[PDB]
Design an enzyme around this catalytic site. Structure first.
Site, PDB file in Angstrom:
ATOM      1  CG  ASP A 197      -1.974   1.095   1.227  1.00  0.00           C
ATOM      2  OD1 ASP A 197      -2.310   1.592   0.127  1.00  0.00           O
ATOM      3  OD2 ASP A 197      -2.411   1.489   2.308  1.00  0.00           O
ATOM      4  CG  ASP A 238      -1.543   7.532   3.544  1.00  0.00           C
ATOM      5  OD1 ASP A 238      -0.601   8.357   3.464  1.00  0.00           O
ATOM      6  OD2 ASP A 238      -2.486   7.651   4.337  1.00  0.00           O
ATOM      7  CB  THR A 283      -2.150   3.384  -3.571  1.00  0.00           C
ATOM      8  OG1 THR A 283      -2.636   4.600  -2.983  1.00  0.00           O
ATOM      9  CG2 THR A 283      -1.620   3.681  -4.987  1.00  0.00           C
ATOM     10  CG  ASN A 284      -8.353   2.580  -1.845  1.00  0.00           C
ATOM     11  OD1 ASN A 284      -8.348   1.891  -2.867  1.00  0.00           O
ATOM     12  ND2 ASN A 284      -9.066   2.227  -0.774  1.00  0.00           N
ATOM     13  CG  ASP A 315      -2.023   2.057   6.561  1.00  0.00           C
ATOM     14  OD1 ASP A 315      -2.499   1.748   5.460  1.00  0.00           O
ATOM     15  OD2 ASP A 315      -2.065   3.204   7.024  1.00  0.00           O
ATOM     16  CG  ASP A 369      40.995   9.054 -16.575  1.00  0.00           C
ATOM     17  OD1 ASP A 369      42.039   8.745 -15.988  1.00  0.00           O
ATOM     18  OD2 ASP A 369      40.844   8.954 -17.807  1.00  0.00           O
ATOM     19  CE1 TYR A 390      50.380   6.121 -16.468  1.00  0.00           C
ATOM     20  CE2 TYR A 390      48.907   5.583 -18.284  1.00  0.00           C
ATOM     21  CZ  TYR A 390      49.197   6.328 -17.154  1.00  0.00           C
ATOM     22  OH  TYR A 390      48.334   7.301 -16.745  1.00  0.00           O
ATOM     23  CE1 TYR A 440      46.315   8.547 -21.046  1.00  0.00           C
ATOM     24  CE2 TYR A 440      44.729   7.474 -22.493  1.00  0.00           C
ATOM     25  CZ  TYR A 440      45.211   7.730 -21.224  1.00  0.00           C
ATOM     26  OH  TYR A 440      44.574   7.173 -20.158  1.00  0.00           O
ATOM     27  CG  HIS A 451      41.623   5.229 -12.166  1.00  0.00           C
ATOM     28  ND1 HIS A 451      42.174   6.502 -12.290  1.00  0.00           N
ATOM     29  CD2 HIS A 451      40.875   4.961 -13.259  1.00  0.00           C
ATOM     30  CE1 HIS A 451      41.773   6.948 -13.462  1.00  0.00           C
ATOM     31  NE2 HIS A 451      40.986   6.063 -14.086  1.00  0.00           N
TER      32      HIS A 451
END
Ligand SMILES: OCCSc1nc2ccccc2[nH]1
Ligand SMILES: OCCSc1nc2ccccc2[nH]1
EC number: 3.3.2.10
Lengths: 546, 546
Positions: A8, A10, A122-123, A184, A334, A382, A465, A523
Site C-alpha cells: 500500500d 499511505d 493504492t486508494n 496499514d 580522469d 606507461y 593521449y 581509480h
C-alpha cells in the site's frame, strides 16, 4: 511459494500516513475524537470520498464536499469548527509532510532483486491542486522501483471492493497463495486474506518487516548498506547532437533543474555514471551523461588532431549552443576531469561550476616540453606506450572482456601496475587470460562496455593521449589566469596514477577551491565508492552550483 | 561585389554600449570628463584592458587592476573617488543593461538570407563573474544567427591590431573589397578601411542601416515584419525514449527551464512547431517537440488499438517517467490538442498547465454513440472516409508532395473543402495534380514532410481517427470531472473544421479557462500565424505556467 509482494502507499511505503493527519488535527484543535475521520468516510461507498478514490471527481472538487461533511458531523456532535477551518490547508500540509518510508522501499527493492514481482496498490485521487507537483515527484521516485502501480482513481475501483483484488491478481499473473500483501488498514487486508493471500497488517515498519522476512525467508532487516539506484540503458532518454558535419555527440538525459554535464574518463562510457545519474536527478538536477568523443554512440573520427583539448572543449560549447543551454555545471573524471578544468579556464561564462574526480589541475610548464615533463615524472611512463598509433589499440582490442575485467578493479583486487608497462611491452603482459570479476561490476555490466567498444574500438579514446604538445601550447595561453568560478576537487586515496598529493598546489590557481576526499577508493571512483561520490557531489551542487 | 557583412558587438549588435557606461558614470558622480575612460585604456597595448581583451587574464582578475588605474587617474586629476566606488557594481549593471539591437540583428538576418556570409568580430573578455550567465545567454541568442563569432579573448588578438583583420579575412575566405565592416569605434574601422573593406561608422542604427542598404543594394530599413526564427532539423538535439518494447518516441529538445511538451496534429511532425521552438526556448522554457506516435522517427505500430486516447496518454506519462520529469506544460494542436485535454483530465498531477490550438474540449455524450454524434454533426462527415483501413492511406500515400501541398494552405489559398469527401470518394478528387506552393511553406519544408512520411506512411496517423468508440467509453469515465489546472484555449477564425464557436461552452467544464483568438488564421495555426501564436503562448506561459 511466494513470488509477489504488494504494498500500500499511505502508511506503508509513505509516512506519515496522510490519513493520520485527521487524528492529529482533531487533537490539535480539541475537536471530538474521530470527528474528521467520520466526515472523511461519510456515506461510505455512495460517499464523496469513494467517488474521489474511484476517479469520478478530482481532489479540488472533493474539498468543498469534505467541508460540508465536517459541518454535518460537527452539528450532530454539537460542536463548532473554528473560524479558520480549512480542509485545503490541512491536506496541503499533510501531503507535503509525507515522505518515502526508506526501510520499506529497501525491503521492496531487495525482494525484487531476489526475483519477486512487486507492486503498489493504492486508494488514491486525481490531484489538481496548485501544489500537486510534490505528490507527482513522490509518485515518480517510488513507482520506478516497482513492476506495477495500481491506482484506484485510474482503475475506477477501490479497496476493499473484491474486483480490485481480482484485478491485482490478473496484473500480477499470480495465484493468491503466491502473493504477500501489506496494508496499514485491516479492513483493506481482509479481501486479500479471504482469497488466500499472505497478509501483513502494517503498524510500525520494523514488526511488518520481521513478519515479511519470516514469510519470504529473505533477509530484509539489518541488511548491508545497499548501492545507489543504477541505470538500465534501454530505459533511458538518449540524446544526439551534431556538433559539426562528421561529429555527433550522444548523451543520456534524466531529471529537471540546472543542467549537470557528466564527462567520463578513459576508456569509459556514459554508463560509468550509472550510480550518479538517478541520484543527481532526484537531487533536483537535469543530468546530461556524455559519451565523450571517440566513445560509444558518439562519433569516433580517426585523426589524432580531432582529440586535442582545444577541439574537444570547442565541441562541448557547440553542444550547449545546439541544446539551447547558456551554462552547465561540468563534472569530469580522469580524461573528463582534465577537459572540465579546461572548460573552466577557456569558457567560464558557459561553466556554472566545475568538479573533478581524481584529476588534479596542474598549470602547463612553459619551460619544459611535455616529453621532458614525463621524463621528470615517471609515474606517467606507461603513457609513452599509448603514443604509437596502433600498438595499444591491438592489445586493448584483442580481447574486450579481458580488457575491461583487467582495468575495472577495486584497490585490493590486484589492480594493473602502471609501472613497467614500457619495459614489459604492454598493459596486460602479467595479467591472466581470464581475469576474475571485480566486486564493482557484474558480468552484464562488463558486456555492456564490450558491446560499446565493438563500434569504434580504442583508437579515438587513445587519441586523447596523443595531443601532448598541442594541449601544452593551448594550456600555456591560460597561464596568467585563475579559476574563480565555483570549483570542487575530489581525491581518491588509492588512485596510484592520479594520486591525491598531485592536487596539493591547486589553491594557488583556484583560491576558493572546495575539496572532497574518498578513503580506500581506487581509480574507478564512481563505481568504487558510489554512495560517497553521490553524497560529496550533491552537497557541493546544492551549496555551490544551485 | 560585397558578399560578407561583419558586425561589432558593443554599440552595434548590442545596446547600450557597455563602453558608454563609463561616460554616464563620470556624469552621474560628477567626476572629471573622460576620467573613467582614461583609466580603462591606461597603458594601451601593454595595459590591463588589452591583457583582458587578449584573454591573458579573466574579468574578475581585471577589476582590481581597473580600480588601481582609477585611483592613479583621480590622483593626477586631483579629485577623489567617492567612498562607495565599485568597478564590479558599475560593470554588473552595464552588462545586464545591455540588450540586442533588434533592428541591427534584423539587417544581419536579412543579408544572410540574401546569401551574405555574416560574422561578429568583437573585443571581448573571459567572464568569470558570479553574474556571467546573463552575458552567456545574450551571446547564445545573438551568435546562432551568424556564420562566425570571433572573440578577441579567444584568438589572443585585439582590434585595432592588423593581424585580427587578416584573421577575419582568412575565416571569411573573402578578399577585403567583398567585405562590409560595421563598428562604433572609428580607430577600430581604420585597419579594415586600410585593407580596402567597406566600413560603416555606427552612431545611430538608422543612419548605419541607410549606409549599409545603399552599399549592399539590399532593403534593410522599412522592411515587412520578419517571421520568427525557424529550426534546421540537422542542428537540433534529437531525443529518443522507449515507452514500451515495440514503441519508441522521438522528440526535438531546446532550451532550459520548465518543460513544455508540444504535441502536433494530423498529419504533421515535430517540425510543425519550428517557429515556436526557438521563441519558447528564448522565453526561458525547456521545449520538447514530439513526433507523436505513428509519425516521423517515433514508432508506428499497425494495430488500430495502439492509437486510442487511453494508450496514447499512458505512453506520454511513461515518456515523462523515463525522462525524470514530474510535470510538463502540454501544448497541443488538432489531434495533439485533443490528447492534451485528456492528459489534463486523467493525469492532472503530471500537467503543469494545458493549452490547445483550435481543438475545443467537448465532454462525451453518454447517451449517444460516436456514429450517432457524427450523424447529428455533419461537419465531421469526411472522418467516415478515414475509417476503412487502407482507403485514405492509398490516396494520401499515392503522391506525398501533392498530399502536403494540398493540405498545407492558408485560408485564402483554395483550401480543401471537407464537405462532400464521402459523396466524392476522396480528399483530393477536385484537387490539381500539381498544387501551387502555399506562402506558409517553402518547397524544402514540403520535402521535409515528404521524407518523414516515407518511413511509416499514413496508417498510424489515420489510426488516431479509428478509435471513436474506445475513446468515447474512456471519456465517459471523466464526465463528473472538471479541468481546474491552468488552461488556455486558442481559437483560429478561419479554421472551418475546428471552428471557434465549437469551443463556446468550454467554461462550463474549465471555469478558469483563459483564451486567445487569431484572426484570418486557417487550420495550420503554427505556420499560418507564427508571430501571433508565439505572443499568445509566451504571455500565457509567463503568467500561468511559470
Ligand atoms: O590525465 C587523465 C588520464 S590518466 C590515466 N587514466 C587511465 C585509465 C586506465 C589506464 C591508464 C590510465 N591513465
Ligand atoms: O479532432 C482533431 C482532428 S480534426 C481534423 N484535422 C485535420 C487535418 C487535415 C484533414 C482533416 C482533418 N480533420
Amino acid at each position: 511459494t511466494l513470488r509477489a509482494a504488494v504494498f500500500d502507499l499511505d502508511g506503508v511505503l509513505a509516512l506519515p500516513a496522510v490519513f493520520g493527519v485527521l487524528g492529529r488535527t482533531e487533537e490539535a484543535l480539541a475537536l471530538p475524537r474521530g470527528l474528521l475521520n467520520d466526515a472523511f468516510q461519510k456515506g461510505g461507498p455512495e460517499g464523496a470520498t469513494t467517488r474521489l478514490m474511484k476517479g469520478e471527481i478530482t481532489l479540488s472538487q472533493w474539498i468543498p464536499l469534505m467541508e460540508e461533511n465536517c459541518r454535518k458531523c460537527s452539528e450532530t456532535a454539537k460542536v463548532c469548527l473554528p473560524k479558520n477551518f480549512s480542509i485545503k490547508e490541512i491536506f496541503d500540509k499533510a501531503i507535503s509532510a509525507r515522505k518515502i518510508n526508506r526501510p520499506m522501499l529497501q525491503a521492496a527493492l531487495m525482494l525484487r532483486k531476489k526475483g519477486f514481482t512487486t507492486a503498489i496498490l493504492t486508494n488514491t485521487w486525481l490531484d489538481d491542486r496548485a501544489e500537486r507537483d510534490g505528490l507527482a515527484q513522490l509518485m515518480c521516485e517510488l513507482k520506478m522501483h516497482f513492476d506495477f502501480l495500481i491506482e484506484s482513481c485510474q482503475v475506477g475501483m477501490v479497496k476493499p471492493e473484491p474486483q480490485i483484488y481480482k484485478f491485482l491478481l490478473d496484473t500480477l499473473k499470480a495465484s493468491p497463495s503466491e502473493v504477500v500483501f501489506l496494508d496499514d488498514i485491516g479492513a483493506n487486508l481482509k479481501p486479500a486474506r479471504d482469497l488466500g493471500m499472505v497478509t501483513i497488517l502494517v503498524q510500525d515498519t520494523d514488526t511488518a518487516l520481521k513478519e515479511l522476512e519470516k514469510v519470504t525467508g529473505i533477509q530484509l532487516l539489518n541488511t548491508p548498506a545497499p548501492l545507489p539506484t543504477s541505470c538500465n540503458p534501454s530505459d533511458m532518454s538518449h540524446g544526439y547532437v551534431t556538433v559539426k558535419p562528421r561529429v555527433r555527440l550522444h548523451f543520456v538525459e534524466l531529471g529537471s533543474g540546472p543542467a549537470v554535464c557528466l564527462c567520463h574518463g578513459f576508456p569509459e562510457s556514459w554508463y560509468s555514471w550509472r550510480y550518479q545519474i538517478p541520484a543527481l536527478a532526484q537531487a533536483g538536477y537535469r543530468v546530461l551523461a556524455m559519451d565523450m568523443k571517440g566513445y560509444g554512440e558518439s562519433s569516433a573520427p580517426p585523426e589524432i588532431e580531432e582529440y586535442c583539448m582545444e577541439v574537444l572543449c570547442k565541441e562541448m560549447v557547440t553542444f550547449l549552443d545546439k541544446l539551447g543551454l547558456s551554462q552547465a555545471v561540468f563534472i569530469g573524471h580522469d580524461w573528463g576531469g582534465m577537459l572540465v578544468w579546461y572548460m573552466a579556464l577557456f569558457y567560464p561564462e558557459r561553466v556554472r561550476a566545475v568538479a573533478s574526480l581524481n584529476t588534479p589541475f596542474i598549470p602547463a610548464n612553459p619551460n619544459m616540453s611535455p616529453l621532458e615533463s614525463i621524463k621528470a615524472n615517471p609515474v606517467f611512463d606507461y603513457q609513452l606506450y599509448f603514443q604509437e598509433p596502433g600498438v595499444a589499440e591491438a592489445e586493448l582490442e584483442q580481447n574486450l572482456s579481458r580488457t575491461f575485467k583487467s582495468l575495472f578493479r577495486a584497490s585490493d583486487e590486484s589492480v594493473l601496475s602502471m609501472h613497467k608497462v614500457c619495459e614489459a611491452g604492454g598493459l596486460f603482459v602479467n595479467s591472466p587470460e581470464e581475469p576474475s570479476l571485480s566486486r564493482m561490476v557484474t558480468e552484464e555490466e562488463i558486456q555492456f562496455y564490450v558491446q560499446q567498444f565493438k563500434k569504434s574500438g580504442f583508437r579515438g579514446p587513445l587519441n586523447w593521449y596523443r595531443n601532448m604538445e598541442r594541449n601544452w601550447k593551448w594550456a600555456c595561453k591560460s597561464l596568467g589566469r585563475k579559476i574563480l568560478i565555483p570549483a570542487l576537487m575530489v581525491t581518491a586515496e588509492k588512485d596510484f596514477v592520479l594520486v591525491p598529493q598531485m592536487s596539493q598546489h591547486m589553491e594557488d590557481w583556484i583560491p576558493h577551491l572546495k575539496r572532497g576526499h574518498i578513503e580506500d577508493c581506487g581509480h574507478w571512483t564512481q563505481m568504487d565508492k558510489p554512495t560517497e561520490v553521490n553524497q560529496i557531489l550533491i552537497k557541493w551542487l546544492d551549496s555551490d552550483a544551485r
